[PDB]
Symmetry: C2
Subunit: 1081 residues, 2 copies
Amino acid sequence: QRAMGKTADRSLMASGHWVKIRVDASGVYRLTDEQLRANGFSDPSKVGVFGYGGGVLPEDLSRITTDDLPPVPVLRQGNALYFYAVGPVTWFYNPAKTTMEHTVNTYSTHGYYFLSDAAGAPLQMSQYTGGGASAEALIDYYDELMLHEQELYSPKESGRDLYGESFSAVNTRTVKFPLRGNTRSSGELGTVFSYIAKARSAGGGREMSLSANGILIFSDPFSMTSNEVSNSYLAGKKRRLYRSTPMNSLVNELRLDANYSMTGDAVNLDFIEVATQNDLRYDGAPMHIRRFSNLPVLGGESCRFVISEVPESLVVLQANSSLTASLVPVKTVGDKTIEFVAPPKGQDRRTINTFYAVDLSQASAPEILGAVPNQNLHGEEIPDLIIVSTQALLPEADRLATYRREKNGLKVLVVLQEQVFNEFSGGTPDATAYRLFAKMFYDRWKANAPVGETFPMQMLLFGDGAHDNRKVSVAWQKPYLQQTEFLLTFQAVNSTNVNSYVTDDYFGLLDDQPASVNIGWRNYNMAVGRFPVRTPAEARIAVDKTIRYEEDRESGAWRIRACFAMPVRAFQDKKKMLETLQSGIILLNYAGHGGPAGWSDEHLLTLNDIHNFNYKHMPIWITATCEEVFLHEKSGTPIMFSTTRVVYNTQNEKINGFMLRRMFEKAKDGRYRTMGEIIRSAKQGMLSTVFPDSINQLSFFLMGDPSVRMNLPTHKVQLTAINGQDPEGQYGTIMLKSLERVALKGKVTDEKGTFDETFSGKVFLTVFDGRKKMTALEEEGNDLSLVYYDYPNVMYAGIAEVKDGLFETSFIVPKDVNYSEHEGRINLYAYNESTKAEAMGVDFSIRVQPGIPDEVTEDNTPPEIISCFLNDSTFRSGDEVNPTPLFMAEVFDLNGINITGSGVGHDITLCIDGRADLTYNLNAYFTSSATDAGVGTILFMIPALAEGDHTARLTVWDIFNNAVHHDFSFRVVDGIAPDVADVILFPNPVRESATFRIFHNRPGSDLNVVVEIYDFTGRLVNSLPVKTYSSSYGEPIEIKWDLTSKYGVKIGNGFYLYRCVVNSPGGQTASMAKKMIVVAQ
Amino acid sequence: AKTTMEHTVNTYSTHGYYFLSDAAGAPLQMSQYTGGGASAEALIDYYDELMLHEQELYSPKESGRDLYGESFSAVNTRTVKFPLRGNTRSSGELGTVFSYIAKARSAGGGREMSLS
Ligand SMILES: [Ca+2]
Ligand SMILES: [Ca+2]
Ligand SMILES: [Ca+2]
């Protein structure tokens, strides 16, 4: 049909009991009913075996015909079931060398399977059908394969392979193979001897020689040039010697003696495969009967096999795999002698069929690892992001997931790599399991996806990866390194293990392209990114860095602030200048070779060790314009692009990175593309144009969350007039005077600076009288501890409506600090409520000037009572209130309210029923507005008053002695008003910590109150909860705040909105939002 | 002050290290105790056997040099059994130093740590 497309809508693992088991050797294993009952299988009759085993999945996806959990055929005796398991070593036929060769599973040390009742019943094994009717030959022996292989050393560069025993010190190493009963005394001894060698000196009489039981098999000459010895990357010549040697008297043990003639060289044995000619006779041990040597028949032609000494508790399975195991129907031909007819080799002339003869009385249990929870990855909806995590790292992964789900609004799926292996490789670790899991969604998406649209999903490998995936090499032997779980690494091995590069791009190759297309030339369908973190501490740091990046809105305005002109100019080859504004340069990080050959191999074991994780050196350049284009490096983006291999151009010119002329072009959604997609399209574009520049074929790592967007504004806020003057291009030019009403006007534009009439919502803006500057407190001591005058005074802070791209507001300059030289600062942040889009701007055109001391006796205008309420904002004079009302009043005088104390009746006072008995000095309850010049606020809890009508007068005086009165009435009704509270922030602006003092109307009573903080986009930063009690005695409550967000990250500088809510039983009463400015973050 | 003896855990080591060596030439021979006074102002019928329950489980970095043990976050009651040995007297004064740390998650409330 061109591809496979039977991805199940629901996994088998979604229900029933599941128990993971494993093997370390191919053979028949057995599970008794007692063992099954003992592992939770209430009814053992319903249990079946599932999975693939060891032996890797094909990288040619078309060859994978199965999906979800494949049922394994099983033989069932009385109170036990049997199945043929497959270990990590598996063998294939090489028609050139007319022999069989082995293959070690790079990802696993074992073949994992599953036991489950979910089935309803086991898949009963069937009779073998391929057994031909007529045999073209009667066979007297089969080929017994054996394999000596020590996975000791792992040179990162060489390949996917590990190497064994060294001949550096020991010039002769002996390997003994046990020869088993049915081995023939005399016959041809087939041997594949694989080793690697790098000479320490040039030329010389160097030779690797093998002799079995004293008979010399071969003597291989080895040599190297002065330039080959002098090279660092050469790192050894791999050699594989095939050969059949007629041998005599091979009976109990086969002693192989490998000798390298020279001491001091870097020479290691990889493995020895040994193939003996054995009789078809049961020798008290199961036998994998295979026949390829001296074949007297053609591919697909049948042969009569006759085994003697069989115990008849023995069966013969034709088992090339676990999923294809079939019971060979035999016939008895004599005492303990059975016969069957079958093809030793397939009709394809590339397959050697395996006939496993085994005495089922001797079969024993596999390794029962235990029960596994139900799962259903197959039934998941197509997410935006897939986070594949290790166990330890899971809550830190889920934290990032929750952040992405909440802030970025997107479907994110978190899974454990174990889970992926369970549903995509029958529980066995395999790099292809990741790829298949992704492919499941890709295929699903493609079905209904419109023509032209690219696959939107992304994958985040939340974990570090080891080059030696099995952690079997000597360097890995160490409990931390051992007991840590890593994600798999995929190593793109080229033709005949010449070179190899480790890559995560493999996981994003989900198309149904043909097998002729190598891993290098296939289409990168899905963006993949990795956080090479080992421990949760590492992980939290990564996630915190990624979260804080998106939230620090002020870091993104620094790249937009570059309008004053490591700025390197790029020499390349109105509408032309517009394309260069959207351009960007990514520079590759080149992970070096820090160690003298052997060090690197013993100490640089994982991706993290190689590509040093801590996002390092200038990675992303933005090309800016006011030939040679000027480009600047901006904002510490969590992402890092890393390679080890170096890449050159025409005539060895080293490639430092790439430039995307359309990097910062916004998508249909009006947002920039995610780094993941930017890189994906980039990567995809390098193979798409590898016809003109064939020499290069670079692969690099996206180390970071692929869902990260460059913190760079989509829209900018631009002031157009300040007190009538045009501020664009001006620095400390527009003069503002103390107590002067300043009128502001501005617009909202796109990133290119074009006016955006579609932008309509609110704009938040804070005005400082100067700039933050380091100040050293001097003295006649050489040491001078220093601060930041982190109090450029806030002149004004407020919100304004933005209609059809524009806005206008005004404010009064406070009578405050103007000794500051140079410019002031206006921060602006706009939010378009409908598109949820954010705009930002910074202006330095204002400069404050000295307020001359004239018209000082002019303030004859008394303070203005802006508002004066009890409990709620909806209070008219004479309304029904409770015996302890919460008195709130906003007040205003241009020259300030007198809090001084004493000096006749100059105090702020509340005199209930014109009696000294009930006259309250409210100087201690007044809090001057840090945000609105001349404004102040009184907040007091009126002590208990008796039921009935009452009257009260608020009197407030200013510094210039002018007074004002405000009379109002209220009826006290016992238990009528709702519960409500208000809060004041001390200090404001906020530097390091914030304190919230809450006042309420129900004293001496418990109440659920909470202080809520919001950002200019309206999103809740956090909700600090508090409980009052009988122990307060009508005293306000205080809350200290460390400025940490709901995601456990410190908030950045900016305009926030604080308020408090009282969670009563019958409803929830909130207070008025109040401006909060943060400055020392 | 508390007219009792208190313990102290070596923060840097789990063991007491020593050395064996012939370098000496001969061992330092232990001497007889001299401080044993000629006349006794009292004949005593018992001594103070000290025991110590201490689990070094949690290490709040801020708090101190000390590690803390068993939590009462989930389990509200934790029992500790000390073996009492032969020469322990059936009846007598039971001296106890009980050290714990506590941060409330809500204000006020009837919270009490009780030993029995
Ligand atoms: Ca190997
Ligand atoms: Ca006045
Ligand atoms: Ca302790």
